[PDB]
Design a protein around this ligand. Sequence first.
Ligand SMILES: CC[C@@H]1[C@@H](O)c2ccccc2S(=O)(=O)N1CC(=O)OC
Ligand SMILES: CC[C@@H]1[C@@H](O)c2ccccc2S(=O)(=O)N1CC(=O)OC
Length: 284
Amino acid sequence: MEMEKEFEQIDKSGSWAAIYQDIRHEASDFPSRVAKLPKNKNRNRYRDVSPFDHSRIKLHQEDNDYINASLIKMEEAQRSYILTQGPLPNTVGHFWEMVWEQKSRGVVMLNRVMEKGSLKCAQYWPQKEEKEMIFEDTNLKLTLISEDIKSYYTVRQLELENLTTQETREILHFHYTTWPDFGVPESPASFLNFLFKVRESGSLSPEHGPVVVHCSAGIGRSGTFCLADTCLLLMDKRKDPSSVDIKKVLLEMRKFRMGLIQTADQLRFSYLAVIEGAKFIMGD
Ligand SMILES: CC[C@@H]1[C@@H](O)c2ccccc2S(=O)(=O)N1CC(=O)OC
Ligand SMILES: CC[C@@H]1[C@@H](O)c2ccccc2S(=O)(=O)N1CC(=O)OC
């Protein structure tokens, strides 16, 4: 069923909550035993948001391989994403170890460091060229190369150096700065413009490791970004763009990380973004 008609049918009836709870009920339940080990309590931001064992990213070290991060692998769309929490004071070195080890070319940040008067993630990148950051626990150096500030987002160029081998790489930091403290954006126009800038950079392409995507918990806004990107790619690839079922794609993604899309309002916003984005994909 064409999703734009499904959309008006749910709106006219106010059945967004009904549909959302049906997704919650049908979602996968897999073990997260590594996340719950006592040695990992200060590596988790939220007690109720954990990576499944089968899909978690492992750090390449013998001491403790744990990070709150999941590999979302979309087989038909041929896209992969790493979804992670906003880094904590004691996991900023782990975060950059993961970007290094997974060969990622882009980091996508969908939150502000402070929202609602509380800290939602560590200040994990340098704000001035001449004040670089060293992560002594993982042996990495991170330098700000350039910054481009726009009305709805900021793009940064970072140099990450593996201090062990003196190898360096160019990492693109895509920072969506205008998601409101409460609710979802009224229009998906600036979120879709942002998604298209990440695509244009090569960060989502198969010649690189998976993009790292985060918000505060790494399930709500982060879920909206990967769900919109995969649905639009499937519309481009298939003979019938009307066959793409956003609820079935979201349940496939929930096989790899719990809780993706946190509210009925985020589910409606994801439908709006895909419907408006398709009016480019189909040739405009
Ligand atoms: C949880 C709120 C949700 C909301 O997304 C919405 C927004 C615009 C128009 C309709 C609806 S809704 O009616 O489907 N709805 C359920 C509702 O009101 O409580 C049962
Ligand atoms: C590998 C990191 C490196 C960085 O030291 C730098 C320096 C000057 C201009 C751009 C960049 S960068 O971040 O893009 N980068 C790759 C690049 O283009 O080579 C210059």
